[PDB]
């Protein structure tokens, strides 16, 4: 038997474990689409946690405020998900195990009346699928 506590169900609730690495969803200010080095280290740990259960694919969604238009918010929502996906794949995930979704301005969570609110609704998120 190995040292330390037991390790049963190592992928059985990994949704909660992946959320615990991220501490929740991630925002986009100043430039509105420019991801931080502090997040890219969180993404290193998410990539390793996915790589510990290549049996359990993920899907990555991203959002934008509604000050833009569909022809601007479709590429912006997809780009936020693709930036996370490309970072995870570069750290060690197989491209087969990550999907991406453009949630442009649907199911909004902040008003566009302030630049902070825009960043709070430009959010990106991850879910096991």
């Amino acid at each position: 038997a190995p040292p330390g506590p037991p390790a049963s169900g190592p992928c059985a609730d990994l949704q909660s474990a992946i959320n615990a690495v991220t501490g929740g969803p991630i925002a986009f200010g100043n430039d509105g689409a420019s991801l931080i080095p502090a997040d890219y280290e969180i993404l290193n740990r998410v990539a390793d946690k996915l790589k510990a259960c290549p049996d359990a694919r993920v899907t990555i969604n991203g959002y934008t405020d509604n000050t833009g238009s569909e022809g601007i918010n479709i590429p912006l929502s997809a780009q936020r998900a693709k930036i996370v996906a490309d970072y995870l794949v570069a750290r060690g995930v197989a491209g087969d195990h990550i999907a991406t979704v453009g949630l442009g301005s649907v199911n909004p969570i902040a008003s566009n009346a302030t630049p902070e609110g825009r960043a709070k609704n430009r959010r990106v998120e991850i879910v096991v699928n």
Side-chain angles (χ1 to χ4, degrees):
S8 53
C11 192
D13 309 273
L14 210 70
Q15 292 269 43
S16 189
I18 290 161
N19 185 63
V21 178
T22 59
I26 2 174
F28 299 89
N30 189 74
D31 300 87
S34 189
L35 195 58
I36 42 173
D39 189 55
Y40 284 124
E41 174 56 13
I42 292 171
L43 295 190
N44 288 323
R45 299 176 192 205
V46 174
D48 184 74
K49 190 165 265 61
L50 200 302
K51 196 172 183 65
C53 188
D55 302 276
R57 303 199 172 88
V58 288
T59 309
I60 303 173
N61 314 331
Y63 297 70
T64 312
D65 66 274
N66 33 45
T67 326
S69 195
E70 188 177 89
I72 321 178
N73 304 345
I74 289 291
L76 275 174
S77 53
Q79 279 167 16
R80 263 68 127 277
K82 284 170 60 66
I83 287 163
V84 183
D86 281 335
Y87 195 82
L88 262 52
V89 168
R91 174 61 167 176
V93 195
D96 183 86
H97 306 157
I98 303 199
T100 54
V101 187
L103 300 188
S105 80
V106 285
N107 293 350
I109 59 173
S111 298
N112 77 320
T114 60
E116 66 167 278
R118 295 174 202 148
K120 287 167 177 178
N121 179 88
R122 286 163 188 186
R123 219 77 75 113
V124 74
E125 63 177 2
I126 190 166
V127 190
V128 185
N129 189 114

